[PDB]
Each structure stands twice: as structure tokens, then as C-alpha cells.
Design a protein around this ligand. Structure first.
Ligand SMILES: Nc1nc2c(ncn2[C@@H]2O[C@H](COP(=O)(O)OP(=O)(O)O)[C@@H](O)[C@H]2O)c(=O)[nH]1
Ligand SMILES: [Mn+2]
Ligand SMILES: [Mn+2]
Ligand SMILES: [Mn+2]
Ligand SMILES: [Mn+2]
Ligand code: NA
Length: 611
């Protein structure tokens, strides 16, 4: 390349790999950003164990992470308290027209996304990235979302100045030299990340955790295939594959190309006859997602295995099977509530080779958090996530409520044998679910594809917040159009449309007590779904959909289960529910609401009116 000085070629700053061996477009991406961001060094990641182990020990030496002496190769990062979670208010999508990104709400701001103009984005970008990596290494992370070379996989390149992001991306994606080799001269998502703390530091570094809260901005430009993220070192903000690529960018590509990218676990369930089916399930926060993908089933002869626990990419094959892959390579799970008693499979997964963030440390070098349900031997003390002595009597929690384990998926004891099959697994049922203290039975089945898409659209995360499809924070484009996209699946000839169900593990009795044991007992609900997919006459028709019959659930060993109240459907509850859904869809979706969803709303209102 022609120059009159030497301010274009950055080969002199490469400390691992070679710019010369990068595909052309990857090199442009790296060098273009090296010019802008002004890193001291460029490290092209190879993904090797040597690379990983050395960068962990470097982070260790610098106080960025601590080694957890109780376990095999586990680490602990404690963050600046300002930078502890994915931050929705700083998360935006850039498109030429606002309406393409979010519907225009009748009043107030959209609850369904956050648009930024191209103009406002360029100003924000120019106020942040020039010189932002001064004095730091720029790491180049070539990564595959999905099994390497799968027809359903997509490749990205993440540039970052954070070793924490490199280590975590090694776990959460497939990364390294082999990905560059598979990429060749193909397309890839451009992902640019900086903690936004150029050296020399302008402000106090807190807890050895670089971040810039005031300038935090996580941007998506689907038309340019770019993700650009500044100022947070944390999770969904900095590990660009998980939410930014896997859901926001991918859902727009899926709309463009005819497939689905969804916030769903994927599981394999085997009945006592050895017959196996895969299901996908979308749950919004606090609704029981964790407990399901790694269920230890109580019913004898049943098996449950985990393909993934957070994101699903699903595309109809030539025979019309809805094929799904987990595009992730590891679990990025919320730590508190992970009970040694209640979730043995998650506990087994995280015993080695795990990076923990903002959990408590025990004096024997172990981990601790609210809801772990493991008493500590007398004498053993606890240091909180804020690096303070902590006692069970104290006011504040020992782990931050959003603290995390970041763990290799291949370590889950019930990881599914097909969790990396390149063609994906055939999905026969899709489950929606939420935390609903009242009115909503344990399980029901949608009357049709269109009814099912309406059921997804009506989901709540808890009591009162709407979280349609569990995708509220993650829509890559206009939600109305996303409903139209789901509905359009019914018109693909030969499509084998999954049965859709809605579950509620969290119905409470008169006194705020759960009416359903849940956890491994949910295997009894799964058996019902399995039989329904096989065409069994085990359902009774109600205004809201099909429910299990009189005596259809296996309740052996649960003693006295209040079936009538668990499956109770109140005309007064459902009348209010339908009015609530109508108002929500009118306000948030309005002119973008598909006809068929309006039709399902009218149908439900009419069925309830005849009660
Ligand atoms: N009663 C009951 N509670 C549950 C069940 N599954 C999860 N929970 C609790 O509800 C809260 C959310 O659970 P979790 O599985 O972490 O939901 P997620 O946030 O969607 O992953 C936690 O306190 C769980 O212990 C269940 O089947 N029954
Ligand atoms: Mn999860
Ligand atoms: Mn999630
Ligand atoms: Mn999780
Ligand atoms: Mn239609
Ligand atoms: Na720290």
C-alpha cells in the first residue's frame, strides 16, 4: 500500500500473529480501527490454551482478577460498582427511519427498543473512539457464533482493549485461528469495543476495573453489519456475541433471510421408551429459565439434556423441520439463586475453568452467593463482591444480584450429544413462560400457529411488565414486523410448525405460597407436552387453549395437588387480562400490529365473553 511517510501500516505494533495473514477485509477493519483508536499494540488472538493461561496470569499479576484456590482453574473479577450490568438506556439501534427499528407508541417512549439517528450516532462516535485505546493492547478476536463451519453459523471479529473480554469470549464463543481459516474472504460482523479509558488515565481507576460510565454507549448498525460499544467492560455490553450479535443483529438478518433468532433455551427430552424430542423455550427474567435447560427430572425413565440455555437460531430445513442451534459456546449465568440443592447440573458445570464476576469469596478460596443453599463449615468466612468482610446478618447481599459465572458449555453434565451438530436439532415444540402469581394455569397449549404467536406477544416477565417473546430488550427491528415475520412462517409450504405452549411455574395460592413444586417436577409438564406433540387425546379445550384433562398429568408422589385451582380459569380474571393486552398492543404496537394478532385478540375476547 502507497504511503508518503509511514502512518498507514501498523505491522510494527503487532505482538502476536500477522496482519499479512489476515483476510483482506479483516485487515482493513483492524488497521482502520488501529488508526482511529491508537492502541500501543495489536494482538491477534489464536484461541490457544497457552494464550489464555498467560493472559489470565497477567490479569492476576495486575490485580484485575484473583485465582480461586479451592477449584481447578477458576477466577474472580470484582468490578467498579458503576459497571455491573448490561445497560438498556445506553443501548441503541441506528437505522435511516426510526419506525424500522421500533413502532411509534401512541404516547411516551417505546418500551420495545431505543432508536438513534445516524447523525446523532456519528457525533457520539466522534466524541468517544478517537485515541481511546492509547497505551493499551488492541486484541483481535475472530469468533464463530455456532459450531465452526455450520451452515447456520455466523462469524464476527471483535476488537477490544479488555483482556477480560478476550478470556470471556474464549469461553462464550468459538474463537481463534481456526475461525479466521474458516472465514476466508467471507462476510463477518464488525464488532468494536473499548473500555474508553485511554492511558494516561484521566480519572481514578476503581477496583482495577476500567470503564467509562458517563460515556457508555452500545450501538448496533444492522445495515452496516457493525456493533460498536464504548465504556462498559461488562457482560452484555462488552461480550459482543451474546446479545448484540446473537439477538439484535441476528434478528434483523433472520428477518432479511427467512429464519429466527430468539431468546430461547433448547433442550432434548427422552421418554421411557427412548423416544427423543427437542423443545425451545423463551422465558423472561425471574420466570424459571435457568431451572429448565438443566433440569434434573423427577419422573423415572425421563431424561433431559441441554443444547443451550439462552439463545436459539432456528431455520426450516429442506424437509420443513425447524432446525435450531445454540450459537454460544458457554454459559453466562446469573450466580445468585444457583442452588447446590436445587440446580445440581449448573453447580457441576462451574466447578472448573470458570470465570466468576462479582460473587463472594470464601476464606478457603471458594465462591459464595445468596441462594447457594450450601452451609459453610464453622470457621469459614466470607468476603463480599465489594471486597468487605461479610456476615449472613448483614444488610447488603454478599454477591451483586447480577453477578455471573462464565463457563464452558461442554462441561455441563447433561449437555446434549447434538449440542454442536452443524445441521441443528429438530424443534417440535416452543414454550413461552412467565412469573404469574394469579389467573394463569400451570400449562396451556395454543389453538393454532397464529394463536401461539399471539400468546408469545402477550407474555409478561412478572406480575405487570410486558416482555413479548422474552425479547423486549433485544428486538433488532420493529416488533410489529417481527410479529409479521413469525406469522409468515405459517405460509412456508411443508413447514412443520412446532406446537406452542405457555407455562406458569409461579402461580401462588391465597397466601403467597406456590401452588406447584416446580423444578424437577416440571418433568411432569414436559411429559404432557411430549404426548400432545405425539397427538395424544390428553387435552381439554378451554377459552384460553387446551389444558391437561382430568387425570392426564402424572401426579404420583406429589401427594395432594390442588388441580382445580392450579388449572382454574376465571372469567373475571380473563376479561381484565384481554383488556390489558388490547391496551398494551394499541399503545406500543398500534399501526404496526398484524391483522392476525388483532384477530386473535378479538377471538379470545369473544371466547371469554361466552363464559
Ligand atoms: N415455585 C417455583 N419457583 C421457581 C421454579 N423455577 C424457578 N423458580 C424460582 O423463581 C426465580 C427465578 O428462577 P430462574 O430459574 O432463575 O429464572 P430465570 O431468571 O428466568 O432464569 C428463582 O428464585 C427460582 O428459584 C419453579 O418451577 N417453581
Ligand atoms: Mn439463562
Ligand atoms: Mn438472556
Ligand atoms: Mn442463565
Ligand atoms: Mn396468515
Ligand atoms: Na477488580
Amino acid at each position: 500500500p502507497p504511503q508518503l511517510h509511514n502512518g498507514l501500516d501498523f505491522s510494527a505494533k503487532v505482538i502476536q500473529g500477522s496482519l499479512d495473514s489476515l483476510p483482506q477485509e479483516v485487515r482493513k477493519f483492524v488497521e482502520g480501527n488501529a488508526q482511529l483508536c491508537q492502541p500501543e499494540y495489536i494482538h491477534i488472538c489464536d484461541g490457544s490454551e497457552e494464550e489464555y493461561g498467560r493472559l489470565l496470569a497477567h490479569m492476576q499479576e495486575e490485580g484485575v482478577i484473583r485465582k480461586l484456590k479451592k477449584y481447578d482453574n477458576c477466577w474472580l473479577a470484582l468490578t467498579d460498582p458503576r459497571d455491573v450490568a448490561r445497560i438498556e438506556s445506553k443501548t441503541v439501534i441506528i437505522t435511516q427511519e426510526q419506525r424500522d427499528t421500533v413502532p411509534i407508541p401512541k404516547s411516551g417512549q417505546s418500551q420495545l427498543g431505543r432508536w438513534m439517528s445516524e447523525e446523532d450516532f456519528e457525533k457520539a462516535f466522534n466524541a468517544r473512539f478517537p485515541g481511546c485505546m492509547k497505551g493499551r493492547t488492541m486484541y483481535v478476536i475472530p469468533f464463530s457464533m455456532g459450531p465452526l463451519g455450520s451452515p447456520l453459523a455466523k462469524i464476527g471479529i471483535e476488537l477490544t482493549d479488555s483482556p477480560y473480554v478476550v478470556a470471556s469470549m474464549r469461553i462464550m464463543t468459538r474463537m481463534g485461528t481456526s475461525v479466521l481459516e474458516a472465514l476466508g474472504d467471507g462476510e463477518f460482523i464488525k464488532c468494536l469495543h473499548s473500555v474508553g479509558c485511554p492511558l494516561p488515565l484521566k480519572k481514578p481507576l476503581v477496583n482495577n476495573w476500567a470503564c467509562n460510565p458517563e460515556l457508555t454507549l452500545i450501538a448496533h448498525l444492522p445495515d452496516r453489519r457493525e456493533i460498536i460499544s464504548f465504556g462498559s467492560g461488562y457482560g452484555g455490553n462488552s461480550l459482543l456475541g451474546k446479545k448484540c450479535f446473537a439477538l439484535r443483529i441476528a434478528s434483523r438478518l433472520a428477518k432479511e433471510e427467512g429464519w429466527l433468532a430468539e431468546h430461547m433455551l433448547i433442550l432434548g427430552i427422552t421418554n421411557p421408551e427412548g423416544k427423543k424430542k427437542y423443545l425451545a423455550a423463551a422465558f423472561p427474567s425471574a420466570c424459571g429459565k435457568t431451572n429448565l435447560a438443566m433440569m434434573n427430572p423427577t419422573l423415572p425413565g425421563w431424561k433431559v439434556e441441554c443444547v443451550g440455555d439462552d439463545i436459539a437460531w432456528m431455520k426450516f430445513d429442506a424437509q420443513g423441520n425447524l432446525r435450531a442451534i445454540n450459537p454460544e459456546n458457554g454459559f453466562f449465568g446469573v450466580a445468585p439463586g444457583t442452588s447446590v440443592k436445587t440446580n445440581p447440573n449448573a453447580i457441576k458445570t462451574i466447578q472448573k475453568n470458570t470465570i466468576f464476576t462479582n460473587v463472594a469469596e470464601t476464606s478457603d478460596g471458594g465462591v459464595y452467593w445468596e441462594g447457594i443453599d450450601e452451609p459453610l463449615a464453622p470457621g469459614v468466612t466470607i468476603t463480599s463482591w465489594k471486597n468487605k468482610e461479610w456476615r449472613p446478618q448483614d444488610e447488603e447481599p454478599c454477591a451483586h444480584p447480577n453477578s455471573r459465572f462464565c463457563t464452558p458449555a461442554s462441561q455441563c453434565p447433561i449437555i446434549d450429544p447434538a449440542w454442536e451438530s452443524p445441521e441443528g436439532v429438530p424443534i417440535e415444540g416452543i414454550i413461552f413462560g412467565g412469573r404469574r402469581p394469579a389467573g394463569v394455569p400451570l400449562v396451556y397449549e395454543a389453538l393454532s400457529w397464529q394463536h401461539g404467536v399471539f400468546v408469545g406477544a402477550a407474555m409478561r416477565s412478572e406480575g405487570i411488565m410486558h416482555d413479548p417473546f422474552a425479547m423486549r430488550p433485544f428486538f433488532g427491528y420493529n416488533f410489529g414486523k417481527y410479529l409479521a415475520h413469525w406469522l409468515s412462517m405459517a405460509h412456508r409450504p411443508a413447514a412443520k410448525l412446532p406446537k406452542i405452549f405457555h407455562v406458569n411455574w409461579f402461580r401462588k395460592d391465597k397466601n403467597g405460597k406456590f401452588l406447584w413444586p416446580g423444578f424437577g417436577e416440571n418433568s411432569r409438564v414436559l411429559e404432557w407436552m411430549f404426548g400432545r406433540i405425539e397427538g395424544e387425546d390428553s387435552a381439554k379445550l378451554t377459552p384460553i387453549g387446551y389444558v391437561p384433562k382430568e387425570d392426564a398429568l402424572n401426579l404420583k408422589g406429589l401427594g395432594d395437588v390442588n388441580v382445580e385451582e392450579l388449572f382454574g380459569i376465571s372469567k373475571e380474571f380473563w376479561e381484565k387480562e384481554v383488556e390489558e393486552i388490547d391496551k398494551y398492543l394499541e399503545d406500543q404496537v398500534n399501526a404496526d400490529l398484524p391483522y392476525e394478532i388483532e384477530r386473535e385478540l378479538r377471538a379470545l375476547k369473544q371466547r371469554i365473553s361466552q363464559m
